[PDB]
From a paper:
Human thymidylate synthase (hTS) is an obligate, stable homodimer with two active sites, each including residues from both monomers. As a dimeric enzyme, it provides the sole de novo pathway to deoxythymidylate (dTMP) synthesis in human cells by catalyzing the reductive methylation of deoxyuridylate (dUMP) to dTMP using methylenetetrahydrofolate (mTHF) as the one-carbon methyl donor. By interacting with its own and other mRNAs, this protein regulates its own levels and those of other proteins involved in apoptotic processes, including bcl2, c-myc, and p53. Its inhibition is usually achieved with compounds that bind at the protein active-site, competing either with the dUMP substrate, such as 5-fluorodeoxyurdine 5’-monophosphate (FdUMP), or with the folate cofactor, such as raltitrexed (RTX) and pemetrexed (PMX) (Carreras and Santi, 1995; Jennings and Willis, 2015). Here we report the discovery of molecules that bind at the hTS monomer/monomer interface and, despite their small size, markedly shift the monomer-dimer equilibrium of the enzyme towards the inactive monomeric form.
To target the monomer-monomer interface and dissociate the hTS dimer, we applied the ‘cysteine tethering’ approach to fragment-based drug design. We selected the ‘Y202 pocket’, which accommodates the side chain of F59’ from the other monomer, as the most promising region to target. We therefore made the Y202C mutant and screened for compounds able to form a covalent disulfide bond with C202 from a library of organic disulfides. We also mutated the active site cysteine to serine to prevent the selection of compounds that bound at the active site (C195S). We made mutants with single point mutations at C195S and Y202C to test their functional and structural properties as well as the double mutant, hTS C195S-Y202C. This was used for the ligand selection according to the above-described tethering approach. As expected from removal of the catalytic C195 residue, this double mutant was inactive, but X-ray crystallography showed that it takes the active conformation of hTS. We employed the C195S-Y202C double mutant to capture compounds that, driven by some affinity for the region near residue 202, formed a covalent disulfide bond with C202. (a–c) Unbiased omit map (blue wired map contoured at 3.0 σ), showing the S,S(2-hydroxyethyl)cysteine (CME) chemical modification occurring at the mutated residue C202, and the mutated residue S195 in the hTS double mutant C195S-Y202C. Four molecules, A5, A10, A20, and TPC also bound peptide (D186-R215) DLPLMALPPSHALCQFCVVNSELSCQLYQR (sequence C), containing the engineered Y202C together with the native C199 and C210. In agreement with the described computational and crystallographic data (see above), Y202C is the most exposed of these three cysteines and is thus easily available for disulfide-bond formation with the RS fragments, being therefore suitable for tethering experiments.
Numbering used by the authors:
A (entry chain C): 26 to 311
B (entry chain A): 24 to 311
The structure:
């Protein structure tokens, strides 16, 4: 078969070859293309990148943490996933003028946007039951009842909430589509750290589509990844040139071990990645 | 591995839906053929992507954008300019059918114009003084381009979930993202739902135009218009007219000319724009 991974590799090539140079956040530098899209097939496999070891336990735990509606970094850290701890640091929170917020409070990030869109954020402990739009449940509801719907959209980019977030979201919006009882997802990702971020991003949304499919009684179709600003940190070029030399191996398969009724009831234990045989880990730093 | 450029992209999308699309139903009975997820890149470099395989309604494109820019949500303000495309959705019947019986006819709700200029604001009606309210996204986009051209956050939103149930229609165009590269301004549109026969050609012209405008206001050269689709659909009653469109030879895109310097985006007038070398094949009729 033609490996969907090649699209990611192809994209990294194309940026190495045609990308333009810019000044990054803090010192490094970047190579950027604007506008990309790749189609990742979800039928009888899972797009977990094989040319390097992807941190799946990160993927799964963080997704469940979004679904939990959590905005507290420690709730995820308690699971052994540290990716958001930097962002909820005492220092880091102060550096964004969040002096009054408790360590770990990330503001209205994905968990909140997904489960309580439009609600007025207070803090990471507040009860937000019945508050804001529960986009994720409405997406699930609409999928079950109206599979032709052209408006099954979940938004995480909220202009009002931006000054309040500990991290501006990479992922502006998702759109779901049903075709002959297959569920497709398209993510508009406004900023893609191609070396570090994107592989994990692909798995994350691929895993979301598996989950929503599973509860609406459908089959995973395609994940379409669309990028706005797709960048490579100079820092990643060398480890990436080596990665481009690796040959992908068949995608693993994802197992859902019990029938789950609701999106809220999923647990880590319910997911087994089978046959994940990656090439050795690559540590991107920047 | 050369990509197709200009109009062939769109002709290739059409073929793709005709050959590979899947039959789906709609709220009328007509039906569509449908594909999910496409992208095309229309160079705006010394040319303007107004389709040639059929004459496009250029005047309408132009007037509709001017209409968005001044923050109008009254279909009659556009109407009085000789462009009717929003009239139906502002009619007494369409309004009653949406539960807005208290609305004067022509009142569309918080559609593009409101969203671009007064985002986050409380929509009251179409005659209301909104100035000073909501986020002027359009002016912020221009300002950010001028002050941090490298910004990765230059997004204009129109899909507001909270405003959706007050809108005549949910927007086809969810969001725009801008990008500055080397003194060239690019724009990517996420169009959640594309009517490929009737809407898409107009849609492309529309957002290429907005790109040309903002590029001008900020002293940049237009770069690319990247068109990204969610649901790309062809209504069954357009298959035949589109089959005819596919046999036609696309001729080179026209150039767009801006005839004076303009300082603010609000000052553009219809007279500031001129399409040149527009050599389209004849109008093809497609019914909504
Ligand atoms: Cl139209
Ligand atoms: Cl002429
Ligand atoms: Cl002719």
């Amino acid at each position: 078969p033609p490996h969907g991974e090649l699209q990611y590799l192809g994209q990294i090539q194309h940026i190495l070859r045609c990308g333009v140079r810019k000044d990054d956040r803090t010192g490094t530098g970047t190579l950027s293309v604007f506008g990309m899209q790749a189609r990742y097939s979800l039928r009888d496999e899972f797009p977990l990148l094989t040319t390097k070891r992807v941190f799946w336990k990160g993927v799964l735990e963080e997704l469940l943490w979004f679904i939990k509606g959590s905005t507290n970094a420690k709730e995820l850290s308690s699971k052994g996933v540290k990716i958001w701890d930097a962002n909820g640091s005492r220092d880091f929170l102060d550096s964004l003028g969040f002096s009054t917020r408790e360590e770990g409070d990330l503001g209205p990030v994905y968990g909140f946007q997904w489960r309580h869109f439009g609600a007025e954020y207070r803090d990471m402990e507040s009860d937000y039951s019945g508050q804001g739009v529960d986009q994720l449940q409405r997406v699930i509801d609409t999928i079950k009842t109206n599979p032709d719907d052209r408006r099954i959209i979940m938004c995480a980019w909220n202009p009002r909430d931006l000054p309040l977030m500990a991290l501006p979201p990479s992922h502006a919006l998702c759109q779901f589509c049903v075709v002959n009882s297959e569920l497709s997802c398209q993510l508009y990702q406004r900023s893609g750290d191609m070396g570090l971020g994107v592989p994990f991003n692909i798995a994350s949304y691929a895993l979301l589509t598996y989950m929503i499919a599973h509860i609406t009684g459908l089959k995973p179709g395609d994940f379409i990844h669309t990028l706005g600003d797709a960048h490579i940190y100079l820092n990643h070029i060398e480890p990436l040139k080596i990665q481009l030399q690796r040959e992908p191996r068949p995608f693993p398969k994802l197992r859902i071990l019990r029938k789950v009724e609701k999106i809220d009831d999923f647990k880590a234990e319910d997911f087994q990645i089978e046959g994940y045989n990656p090439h050795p880990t690559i540590k991107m730093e920047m």
